[PDB]
Amino acid sequence: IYGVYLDQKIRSRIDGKWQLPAAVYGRMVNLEPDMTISKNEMVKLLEATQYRQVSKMTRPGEFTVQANSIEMIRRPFDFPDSKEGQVRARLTFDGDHLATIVNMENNRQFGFFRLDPRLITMISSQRLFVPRSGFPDLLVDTLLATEDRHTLTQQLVKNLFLSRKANEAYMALIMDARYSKDRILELYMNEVYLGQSGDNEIRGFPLASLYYFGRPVEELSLDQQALLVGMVKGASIYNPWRNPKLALERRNLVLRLLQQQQIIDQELYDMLSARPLGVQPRGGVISPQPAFMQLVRQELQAKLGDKVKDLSGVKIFTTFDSVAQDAAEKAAVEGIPALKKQRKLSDLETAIVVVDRFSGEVRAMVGGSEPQFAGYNRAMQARRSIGSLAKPATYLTALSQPKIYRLNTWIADAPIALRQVWSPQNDDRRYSESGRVMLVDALTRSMNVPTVNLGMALGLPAVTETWIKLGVPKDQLHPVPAMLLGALNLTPIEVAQAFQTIASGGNRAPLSALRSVIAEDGKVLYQSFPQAERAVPAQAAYLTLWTMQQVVQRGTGRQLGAKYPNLHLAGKTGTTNNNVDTWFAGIDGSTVTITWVGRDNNQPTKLYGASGAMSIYQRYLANQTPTPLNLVPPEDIADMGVDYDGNFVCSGGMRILPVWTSDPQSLCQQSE
């Protein structure tokens, strides 16, 4: 009964079938002649779209770099607009911009050169069962040149059934005749043990192609197939990131082993033997971008519905920006250890969210001080208290009443006591000796007593109505005199949507991460359109966004205006009582960034809002090239000058402040 027993056990493991996976792409870049991008700014964009920089390109996906230009072979892609193939373009640069996109094939010109998006990850529900015809032709021939399976039957049983010399040996004898030799290797190449990551087993050539190179197995270069085949006798000995000198002498060994049965000449060998390890030089992950992909799967469940379970072969198009995500992670993993050691802190975390200024598309996300971990997303689940970051919504309600509240209205700065008895004290405990401060020196310096004296005069039923227009949920707003100073609990994904209505000029655009979902045959299952609803007046969201340029240049965030004085950042620094949380919401010409820095156990941190999330931010700016903030004044905004006593004057004045007025002759009445 031995023969009958083993046969039934074989079919048990062999069965379990397959389907295709769904691919998740990033955003699409469109290169254009005379566009603001440098050569070193262009190599960091291609290297983030998974473009191997080689010294002699021969296969789609490789780009070389030259004197003052960049040659490249754009890999084929099926764009939602049209279907395109290879393109050999030579991007000639002109210093700080892009001159020409001459097509190398016939020295033609290009109107605008489209770039294929990057593959974030593949999702199946890993199934990843590429059939016997989905593997390259030089892959089986490279596995046979180093594993003659004209030998392959025993190797299958060792990986499949084992992690018993009698069982597996008898297993191989009955598997050889019962199954065809083309059904054998199809099960082998999809089950080989090729590496170990943490506690998860990297099995198969499909799943090991994405793990090591981040690209489908049908696109492996012949020097990358030799590395992946040379690591069948590897498994945490011959793998890179540990011994990237031993995987290399095994890579070259398989090449000269597979050039014996001639399929590579000496010119091709010296070419391939010189290319370094093509592995993604960051550390492969089984499930990459876990913080962002939580926002996508949530967006897929809501926007599609019950069809989210039948995603087979569909291409998913997101708004993920890869250059901004590399700079967001590079600042969290390298900034948090620099804050912990200086204050002798035991733990410390972070979260960073980047959205587009005018459209609300999410470009980056970081869930913690180790963004490549999984299990807790602090940018979507950590509900912290915003603190001093809730003043821009008090002054945005004052400034939306231009008949009575301007940038020079005098606010009282006297000791106050209310009934929640409550008596706020300034964040530095100092009081103005004149007894009053203007409405611009109150937000620039982030004063606590004037903000209450201004917030109590408007009434909380009005400061609450502003918070709802900005896009916070009605259930988080509990109206008490402490809300004015930031007794508000919001996740970094709700603070980024609040400061996006101020940054765009009042146009509330709902944050999104799905661009479009195209089925496998060409049918469009979902196509996103902008909403961009109007919330606050464009003249009140400019006077607030102007004052937020003073809180960066000479205000509480002046330490940024001394480092990037050309960008003209706008940003509010957030502090709390005893520094439980510290934020920094900063705005530049293109994106809104929200940073949080605090301890998960809710204890004090010793970090001040100008040294916590603000120091993580001035790293995020250094890891890329930001766009300057240029505020264009809307209609009816007219600059007027004030004298010493804070009155409008006809000409001169010791200070110039914008004023929302349709008849700038208000100074004629206030001069007299």
Author numbering: 82 to 98, 100 to 207, 212 to 236, 267 to 279, 286 to 542, 547 to 798
How do the authors describe this structure?
The last two steps in this pathway occur through the activity of penicillin-binding proteins (PBPs). Inhibition of either of these crucial, PBP-mediated, final steps in PG biosynthesis results in destabilization of the cell wall and ultimately cell death. In all, the modelled regions span residues 82–98, 100–207, 212–236, 267–297, 286–542, and 547–798. The overall tri-partite architecture of PBP1b is as previously observed in MoeA-liganded structures, with the canonical and well-described C-terminal transpeptidase (TPase) domain, central putative activator binding domain (UB2H domain), and N-terminal membrane-anchored glycosyltransferase (GTase) domain all able to be modelled into the cryoEM reconstruction as a complete structure of the apo state of E. coli PBP1b.
Here, we determine the near-atomic resolution structure of the 83 kDa class A PBP from E. coli, PBP1b, using cryogenic electron microscopy (cryoEM) and a membrane mimetic. Following complete processing of the PBP1b data, including subtraction by masking of clear features corresponding to the SMA membrane mimetic in initial maps, a cryoEM reconstruction of the apo state of E. coli PBP1b was produced, showing well-resolved map features for all three domains of PBP1b and an overall resolution of 3.28 Å. Despite the expected broad structural conservation of the apo PBP1b in comparison to previously solved MoeA-liganded structures, significant domain rearrangements are observed between the two states. The TPase domain and the UB2H remain as a near-fixed domain dyad, but with an ~40° relative rotation of the GTase domain with respect to the fixed TPase/UB2H pair (measured by UCSF Chimera11). In the apo form, R134 adopts an extended rotamer conformation, with its guanidino group forming hydrogen bond interactions to both the carboxylic acid group of D345 and the backbone carbonyl of P398 (R134-D345 and R134-P398).
